[PDB]
Design brief:
Subunit structure (chain C): Heterodimer of an alpha and a beta subunit. Interacts with FLNB. Interacts with HAX1. ITGAV:ITGB6 interacts with FBN1. ITGAV:ITGB6 interacts with TGFB1.
Distance between the termini of chain A: 9 Å
Bound molecules: a molecule of 6 linked components (NAG-NAG-BMA-MAN-MAN-MAN), a molecule of 3 linked components (NAG-NAG-BMA), a molecule of 2 linked components (NAG-NAG), 2-acetamido-2-deoxy-beta-D-glucopyranose, calcium ion, magnesium ion
Subcellular location (chain C): Cell membrane; Cell junction, Focal adhesion
Radius of gyration of chain A: 5 Å
GO molecular function (chain C): integrin binding; metal ion binding; molecular function activator activity; virus receptor activity
CATH superfamily of the largest domain in chain C: von Willebrand factor, type A domain
Radius of gyration of chain C: 30 Å
Helix content of chain C: 10-25%
Order of helices and strands of chain A: H
Number of strands of chain A: 0
Membrane topology (chain C): Single-pass type I membrane protein
Distance between the termini of chain C: 32 Å
Number of domains of chain C: 3
Shape of chain C: elongated
CATH architecture of the largest domain in chain C: 3-Layer(aba) Sandwich
Strand content of chain A: under 5%
Chains: A mainly alpha, B mainly beta, C alpha+beta
Strand content of chain C: 25-35%
Main location (chain C): membrane
Helix content of chain A: 25-40%
CATH topology of the largest domain in chain C: Rossmann fold
Oligomer: heterotrimer
Largest interface: B-C, 52 and 39 residues
Amino acid sequence: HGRGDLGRLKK
Amino acid sequence: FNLDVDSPAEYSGPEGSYFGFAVDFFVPSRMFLLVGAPKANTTQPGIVEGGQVLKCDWSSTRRCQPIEFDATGNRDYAKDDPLEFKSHQWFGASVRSKQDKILACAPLYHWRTEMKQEREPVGTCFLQDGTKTVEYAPCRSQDIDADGQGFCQGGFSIDFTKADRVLLGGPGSFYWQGQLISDQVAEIVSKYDPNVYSIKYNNQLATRTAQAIFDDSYLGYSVAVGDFNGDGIDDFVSGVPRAARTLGMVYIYDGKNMSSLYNFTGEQMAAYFGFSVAATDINGDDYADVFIGAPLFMDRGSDGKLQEVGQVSVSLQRASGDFQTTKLNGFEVFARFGSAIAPLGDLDQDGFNDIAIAAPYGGEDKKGIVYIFNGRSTGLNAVPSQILEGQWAARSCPPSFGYSMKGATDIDKNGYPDLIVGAFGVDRAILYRARPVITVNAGLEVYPSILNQDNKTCSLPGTALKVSCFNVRFCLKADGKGVLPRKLNFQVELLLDKLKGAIRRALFLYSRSPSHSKNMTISRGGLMQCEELIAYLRDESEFRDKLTPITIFMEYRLDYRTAADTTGLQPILNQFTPANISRQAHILL
Amino acid sequence: GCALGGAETCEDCLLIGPQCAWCATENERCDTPANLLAKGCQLNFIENPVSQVEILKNKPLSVGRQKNSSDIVQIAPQSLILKLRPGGAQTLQVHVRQTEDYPVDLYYLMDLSASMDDDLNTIKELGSRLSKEMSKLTSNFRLGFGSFVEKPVSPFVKTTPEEIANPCSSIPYFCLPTFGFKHILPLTNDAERFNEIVKNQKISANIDTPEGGFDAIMQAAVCKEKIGWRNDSLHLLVFVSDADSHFGMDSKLAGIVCPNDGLCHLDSKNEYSMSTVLEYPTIGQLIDKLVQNNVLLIFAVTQEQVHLYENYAKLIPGATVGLLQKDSGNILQLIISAYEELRSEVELEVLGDTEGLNLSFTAICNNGTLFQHQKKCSHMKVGDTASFSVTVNIPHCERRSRHIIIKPVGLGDALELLVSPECNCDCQKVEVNSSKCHNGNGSFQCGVCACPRCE
Ligand SMILES: *[C@@H]1O[C@H](CO)[C@@H](O[C@@H]2O[C@H](CO)[C@@H](O[C@@H]3O[C@H](CO[C@H]4O[C@H](CO)[C@@H](O)[C@H](O[C@H]5O[C@H](CO)[C@@H](O)[C@H](O)[C@@H]5O)[C@@H]4O)[C@@H](O)[C@H](O[C@H]4O[C@H](CO)[C@@H](O)[C@H](O)[C@@H]4O)[C@@H]3O)[C@H](O)[C@H]2NC(C)=O)[C@H](O)[C@H]1NC(C)=O
Ligand SMILES: *[C@@H]1O[C@H](CO)[C@@H](O[C@@H]2O[C@H](CO)[C@@H](O[C@@H]3O[C@H](CO)[C@@H](O)[C@H](O)[C@@H]3O)[C@H](O)[C@H]2NC(C)=O)[C@H](O)[C@H]1NC(C)=O
Ligand SMILES: *[C@@H]1O[C@H](CO)[C@@H](O[C@@H]2O[C@H](CO)[C@@H](O)[C@H](O)[C@H]2NC(C)=O)[C@H](O)[C@H]1NC(C)=O
Ligand SMILES: *[C@@H]1O[C@H](CO)[C@@H](O[C@@H]2O[C@H](CO)[C@@H](O)[C@H](O)[C@H]2NC(C)=O)[C@H](O)[C@H]1NC(C)=O
Ligand SMILES: *[C@@H]1O[C@H](CO)[C@@H](O)[C@H](O)[C@H]1NC(C)=O
Ligand SMILES: *[C@@H]1O[C@H](CO)[C@@H](O)[C@H](O)[C@H]1NC(C)=O
Ligand SMILES: *[C@@H]1O[C@H](CO)[C@@H](O)[C@H](O)[C@H]1NC(C)=O
Ligand SMILES: *[C@@H]1O[C@H](CO)[C@@H](O)[C@H](O)[C@H]1NC(C)=O
Ligand SMILES: *[C@@H]1O[C@H](CO)[C@@H](O)[C@H](O)[C@H]1NC(C)=O
Ligand SMILES: [Ca+2]
Ligand SMILES: [Ca+2]
Ligand SMILES: [Ca+2]
Ligand SMILES: [Ca+2]
Ligand SMILES: [Ca+2]
Ligand SMILES: [Ca+2]
Ligand SMILES: [Mg+2]
């Protein structure tokens, strides 16, 4: 759940 | 239907260079062909397959010459710190020309951020007006990374307006929401500065970043221009093939303030509605019409099964603001009909603009097919009047004949617009020239058409016995638009009692024969040429068939070999027009 | 009616209508048979090539768990010859029944994007748990494994040296470099082998949210020998992802403009070697290959993707969608539910030379009720029979016959159809220069002299 494929890990 | 397929001009480039991925014309008093070869090796220092755009001459010899937009290698941001990456940038992936301006782009051009050391595909364009050449990279800004214009790939699609404004498409902006950027050609060259990598243009029109739900839409995937609010200013049309959950959409924006005007939506998932778009008035009402390609559309047959055939929607712009939309389905499975849509102008000069639609992977051996469609008062004629076939077999990429094409330019001053068709898979580009169109008005009178067998008027030479006779008169008149000869030589045949193995009831007086051949030289523009002739009925005792009508048949053809022009371009008879006519006579009962 | 045709040739008489007949006697000869016998025609001379069927192989449907696989019959009949007069349609009664115990193949195709890290911790023992439940429902269960992320090319992936070596170098987090599709485990009975394969998986990453799943789906369906699909068994392809998918000409952004060929491109390392060469497959291409390889596609996707993949599934025969949790906690239930769903669904499919042919379907599901314009049955207990009325018609007289296959979606059993047109008479088998037409001035055929003789 986030913007981009790295969304979850970025959060 | 009038495109010359016997001897079309074949241009070729280096193998593997994708020569023909993008094509256009160049009309500065000489004429030229513009071909994109995005995978072409250049002499640029350290740059492998930078790509190039070749200027090919149509006149006399067939010579393509590379156009030097940029001879330099990678500029440095700092010492041992390259600013850009021009290798494999696909320069010439899109080429667009207007008068003395040539715009070519490199969608896969990457550059270094001026903050950190990145490699972001912002895309770049070079604009060449006569002598001055400038760079144009509107996505190469301070708005970096995917959230911004970092992956914009500006110049993925481009176009010119009629007031010398550029329309550029960038499908990757704002996490692939896509973007349209529009600048006036004067500011592009004027505000250009070789020491500034992010140039601000004052009169720039651009779509803005929207909500995250609109990510992965690919706005700017394709573009086209045309007026749609009747203010004379070309408005922006663009395909957004992944919008609406892969249903695909097409956005229309006002060409003055980038305000939203109209929307189109696909009717099938993942049909790639919006892969290609085009805008041209097809029904002669001076209202531009929208053509949207969806090459992956699946249609159901009589057997009920889905088949991928592709679809183009034709949307006729009403004065009321609405669109009267029809749909045109492809013919061959997996051929991807609708991959390219090229306005041809008035290909046959009948008063209505025409359009070409390609199925680049159709035909035998996947050699590509191009379909020609003619306009009329009621819109586009759904049945194609000509089928253009690819001639070149595949070795690894398919030939992709039709993948790019350009029309609406009269390159040979023949009064008719011609057509360029690219086939990058075989590194080839082909110019098809339009043949001049002859409209013929042929006539056939049979008087009297009711025949009294008992009349016997005309005496016959050698016998005292008179026969029942009547007059057969056939007329011929022709004319055409553009450059065609004055003197047209026709060959005309007449056959009496045509639907008769069975015996011929009517014969010509002088020849005593049912058939008559005649050479007829007529002048274009000129008066009608006629020839009268006498035919007679057989004696009443000679046949038992009195009820069946005696059909007089007239057939005519042209000398194409002798009507040709200095370039060997042979004219052609207008379609829908009968190369023969028939009239029948009856015997009295 | 059948009159006013022309009465030129018996052959042309059959063209104007399937109800029309010819009287090849010298005793508007083209007319209906009810009319012809009364008009003064003969019994042996009325030529009526009527449409008919000839059952070749019609074995009764087996039911009730059979130990011998070759005795299993799930469709009836199995072989048919269909002689069709042009215009005269014929309705086939096709019966389908699923057997109690039948081999199932399962290929677990998992998204290994950075958003799928939490999912992995829970699947570490999915293998033994899945094969334990499936053991109850079938005696031959086989699982395999494959993974995917994305085409490892710009702009789908950042291409700086650091980002290539570790695409989660920006988080900063440790991930494997992006790869297209890896076929790790060939389908086997050892469920324990599946477990160990999962615990060794490592997460990747890229940029854009949709992924390159369709590349993997295509490869999984086509590569039969490599993946290990059994011949007479259910082929289940479970697609696990929390993202949209790239398709078709999305790869133009990456400069990939050569269409997918639907061929197997798994190298010595069992990796998709055309990931950077060929485009993403199209839905039409996936449909084509899934049907040809009889592969049933299960979309285990999260809430945000459910509705999107539902629409895809409606185009793909045999495809279903299961709501996957954020941590894939329910993948067991989804697979079993889906399996039991296909276990009660019966879809007909018509393959082969069916172009230019009129086909219509009515489904006799459950209680006996009939569904018009439908070739699909649902809510069936395993053992229940589904009957379909397939109506076949040839519009115009053809030259060569048509090879057609009617089969249930997902099942191996099939109904072969040899549709051969009948547009010719027996009378045209013609006396050149016969003595019947004035000393051989013409040929005699079909009761009429072809030079009313030449006298
Ligand atoms: C054709 O189809 C396209 C595609 O749908 C249509 O284009 C869409 O049109 C709609 C309607 O106009 C657009 O919705 C608007 O979105 C803007 C977004 O503004 C952005 O920029 C702001 C800074 O300038 C920023 O503040 C905004 O952030 C807000 O939104 C986020 C959402 O999560 C929120 O978290 C923030 O806190 C902000 O609130 C945003 O980033 C928005 O400004 C518009 O507001 C209008 O509507 C609201 C409704 O309540 C109203 O209150 C406002 O006064 C204003 O009227 C509106 O929401 C959408 O963005 C367009 N999409 C694209 C891709 O362009 C197009 O209209 C169709 N044409 C036709 C003819 O049908
Ligand atoms: C018997 O046969 C003769 C010969 O065909 C018929 O004479 C023909 O008469 C017509 C009419 O006068 C002539 O044709 C033309 O008449 C039109 C007017 O309709 C005129 O405008 C034309 O330009 C042309 O003059 C025709 O020349 C003439 N035929 C010949 C060979 O001279 C006659 O009518 C027949 N009689 C009957 C009772 O049918
Ligand atoms: C963008 O430009 C168009 C065209 O110049 C504007 O259209 C006008 O809209 C007003 C009402 O909003 C009408 O009264 C005018 O007749 C329209 N003019 C034309 C030529 O169509 C539009 O309003 C502009 N929008 C913005 C946001 O600037
Ligand atoms: C005279 O011209 C007509 C057309 O005016 C020809 O008719 C063609 O008939 C065939 C029948 O299969 C059609 O497929 C063609 O399309 C028709 N032609 C056109 C131009 O539409 C007719 O055959 C011609 N007669 C002779 C003797 O040549
Ligand atoms: C360009 O040159 C490079 C040199 O390594 C070569 O590999 C490549 O194939 C060339 N491109 C074409 C289109 O020939
Ligand atoms: C008409 O002229 C052509 C050449 O111009 C000739 O070949 C042909 O025989 C001529 N027709 C007749 C009927 O003599
Ligand atoms: C003609 O029909 C009659 C019956 O009406 C039959 O008896 C006779 O044999 C037929 N003639 C021939 C030659 O078949
Ligand atoms: C299954 O039964 C058939 C006929 O009853 C027989 O020919 C076949 O050998 C059996 N299967 C095996 C594996 O023996
Ligand atoms: C599997 O089935 C296919 C089609 O039914 C057949 O062509 C093939 O020979 C079979 N192979 C084996 C190993 O049974
Ligand atoms: Ca406008
Ligand atoms: Ca119009
Ligand atoms: Ca026209
Ligand atoms: Ca021309
Ligand atoms: Ca997760
Ligand atoms: Ca992705
Ligand atoms: Mg992901």
